[PDB]
Write a structure and sequence with these properties.
Length: 219
């Protein structure tokens, strides 16, 4: 519980982006329990729909204030509020596709405000992203560490495919508070991110995420 970060918190998110040159925008609203590590969101494509690419490359960009942390791991991103934090991400896919993301998180009138900019490039026209063959992310673990006054995370990620195969990516993210709050040591964040409902052309999508920090066991 907390005065700034309450046990139940809503957010609003705006994304502008392009993937292989296709421009789009998304608006959404979310809610969750920041100290329990759970959240949901409802997203709507508002420009450029229906998207000609897999929703799954967008789903991890819609909220790490909602990670459950044990008391002995400083919860840097919660401590950054009310001012908030920024994050920057590179996602390199095994077939050469690249997604870069920048994000601003703030708190306004008791709700989080998320502003996302996204650029996907170099996806093969034949690959599973532009052919919409992906079927969600496998549960994953983000390895966290402090560096140069920011919190960094790195993860190996895997998308399931309609043909029963998999499509891998590496994620690198830097999270920086707008004020100089306490950084944690190294630890792991276990993440499960699900698409819980969508319409036929993925112009209306709902997501759920559970995330929890746990002590590293070395790897």
């Amino acid at each position: 519980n907390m005065a700034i970060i309450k046990e139940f918190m809503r957010f609003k998110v705006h994304m502008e982006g392009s993937v292989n040159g296709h421009e789009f925008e998304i608006e959404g609203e979310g809610e969750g329990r920041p100290y329990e590590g759970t959240q949901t969101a409802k997203l709507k494509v508002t420009k450029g729909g229906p998207l000609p690419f897999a929703w799954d490359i967008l789903s991890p960009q819609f909220s790490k204030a909602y990670v459950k942390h044990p008391a002995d791991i400083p919860d840097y991103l919660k401590l950054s509020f009310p001012e908030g934090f920024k994050w920057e991400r590179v996602m390199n896919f095994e077939d050469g596709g690249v997604v870069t993301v920048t994000q601003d998180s703030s708190l306004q009138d008791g709700e989080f405000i998320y502003k996302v900019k996204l650029r996907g490039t170099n996806f093969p026209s034949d690959g599973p992203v532009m052919q919409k063959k992906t079927m969600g992310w496998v549960a994953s673990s983000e390895r966290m560490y402090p560096e140069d006054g920011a919190l960094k995370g790195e993860s190996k990620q895997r998308l399931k495919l309609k043909d029963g195969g998999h499509y891998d990516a590496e994620f690198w993210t830097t999270y920086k508070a707008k004020k100089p709050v306490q950084l944690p040591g190294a630890y792991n964040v276990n993440i499960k991110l699900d698409i819980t409902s969508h319409n036929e052309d993925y112009t209306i999508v709902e997501q759920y995420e559970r995330a929890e920090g746990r002590h590293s066991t070395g790897g």
